[PDB]
């Protein structure tokens, strides 16, 4: 080798050091992705690219929104996708299910789990109890649906609205259980626009995602 070549060799080696050191900081931060229609409370949960940073239980979280036809290929290596849906506007609920069907069934999101936030459930309680709008006018199957007695974890919570919540969630989980093959799982949650506990919920779900990701690495699941 010559004299400048060894100086070019050292320039490469130093760049290798910064490349490998910067990668370590990336492995300690979990990347997410926010999705949802307008007036879905998308930007008011944890409180083109518009990044968001926060940490819960000393683990860094990085949350992204775009403002999905074909640029979604870029987010193939995200820890999870955060789908946010209005649970009060029964007019456009079906367009939310159709939105969720494409994300779940997309080719490039086969191994990406989804955290589903059923936002604005405070309006949902007010709407169904007010006795003006009826869900059956938008989903005929509602009149023949019974609240599953297996789960009733809603304390201090009205019974009529309870039937509506377990029906909105059912219409989103049947899609997840339709064609998932156990590669990715859906985690549903019911949130208001005042709940400060949403950062915890992502942490617990992103812990199960990584736990499953580690189990599949060891051929256990």
């Amino acid at each position: 080798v010559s004299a400048e070549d060894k100086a070019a060799a050292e320039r490469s080696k130093m760049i290798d050091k910064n490349l490998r050191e910067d990668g370590e900081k990336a492995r300690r931060t979990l990347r997410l992705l926010l999705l949802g229609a307008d007036n879905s409370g998308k930007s008011t949960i944890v409180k083109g690219i518009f990044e968001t940073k926060f940490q819960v239980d000393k683990v860094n979280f990085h949350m992204f929104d775009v403002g999905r036809r074909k640029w979604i290929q870029c987010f193939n290596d995200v820890t999870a996708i955060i789908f946010v849906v209005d649970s009060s506007d029964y007019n456009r609920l079906q367009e939310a299910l159709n939105d969720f069907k494409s994300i779940w069934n997309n080719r490039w999101l086969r191994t990406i789990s989804v955290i589903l936030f059923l936002n604005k459930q405070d309006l949902l309680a007010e709407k169904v109890l007010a006795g003006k709008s009826k869900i059956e006018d938008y989903f005929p199957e509602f009149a023949r649906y019974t609240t599953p007695e297996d789960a009733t974890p809603e304390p201090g919570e009205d019974p009529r609205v309870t039937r509506a919540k377990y029906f909105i969630r059912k219409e989103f989980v049947d899609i997840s259980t339709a064609s998932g093959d156990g590669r990715h799982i859906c985690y549903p949650h019911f949130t208001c626009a005042v709940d400060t506990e949403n950062a915890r919920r992502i942490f617990n779900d992103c812990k199960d995602i990584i736990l499953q990701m580690n189990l599949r690495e060891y051929n256990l699941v």
Partner: protein, 248 residues
């Protein structure tokens, strides 16, 4: 008579795993990802490869007439490879326990080259054991006394039991955490039973019977031919159990 029964079966089983092990040793060299789990399996296939090569040659040398000089080189390769592989089954299980107990740490805060370093230590530890067996039992104390060797056989049995405690405990802690999921139960039980009664019974029968005394009528016709055969069954099924299950 009975020798040709197990010896022929041992060699055939040895060849089934010896060529299967090389496939794993070749398949993981093409990969460039090399996650933590694959490194232990790669070092397990190499460690298992040497053991069957020693066992295939030793058992084949029983059929035709064989000399006594080579038996001084096959043995301290067979053992150096035998103990190394067992310490990787224990290492793999320990990391399964950590991967489930602490998933965030194992994927985010875990040191990247932890798997590579720990595999070297186990290789070194298997080599420190061999020198202690050779020095304390052989030429360096041939004329001194014959009661220095029993210490090397005691440490070896103690080493064997430690690997069983680590494996069985690590597999059990993972099960408790999960209950506190069908392929989990099958894989964990399989990785424990196959270890305990296929690779464990050799070594615990070869070394306890030098530290102690027992009748020679059954020492060979019952618990040496069979033990050396089950030993060749563990080290052949490991590539299937730990790597090739993902291929089907």
């Amino acid at each position: 008579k009975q020798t040709l029964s197990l010896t022929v079966l041992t060699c055939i089983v040895s060849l089934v795993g010896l060529t299967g092990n090389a496939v794993v040793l070749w398949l993981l060299g093409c990969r460039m990802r090399r996650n933590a789990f694959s490194i232990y399996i790669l070092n397990l296939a190499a460690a298992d490869f040497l053991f069957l090569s020693g066992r295939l040659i030793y058992s084949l040398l029983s059929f035709i007439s064989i000399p006594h000089t080579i038996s001084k080189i096959l043995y301290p390769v067979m053992m150096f490879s035998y103990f190394a592989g067992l310490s990787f089954l224990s290492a793999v299980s320990t990391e399964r326990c950590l991967s489930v107990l602490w998933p965030i740490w194992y994927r985010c805060h875990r040191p990247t080259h932890l798997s590579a370093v720990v595999c070297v230590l186990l290789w070194a530890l298997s080599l420190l054991r061999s020198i202690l067996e050779w020095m304390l039992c052989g030429f360096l104390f041939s004329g001194a006394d014959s009661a220095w060797c029993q210490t090397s056989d005691f440490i070896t049995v103690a080493w064997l039991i430690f690997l069983c405690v680590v494996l069985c405990g690590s597999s059990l802690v993972l099960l408790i955490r999960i209950l506190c999921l069908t392929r989990l139960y099958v894989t964990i039980l399989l990785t424990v039973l196959v270890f305990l009664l296929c690779g464990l019974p050799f070594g615990i029968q070869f070394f306890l019977f030098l530290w102690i005394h027992v009748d020679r009528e059954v020492l060979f016709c019952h618990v040496h031919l069979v033990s050396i055969f089950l030993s060749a069954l563990n080290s052949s099924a490991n590539p299937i159990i730990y790597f090739f299950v993902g291929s089907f």
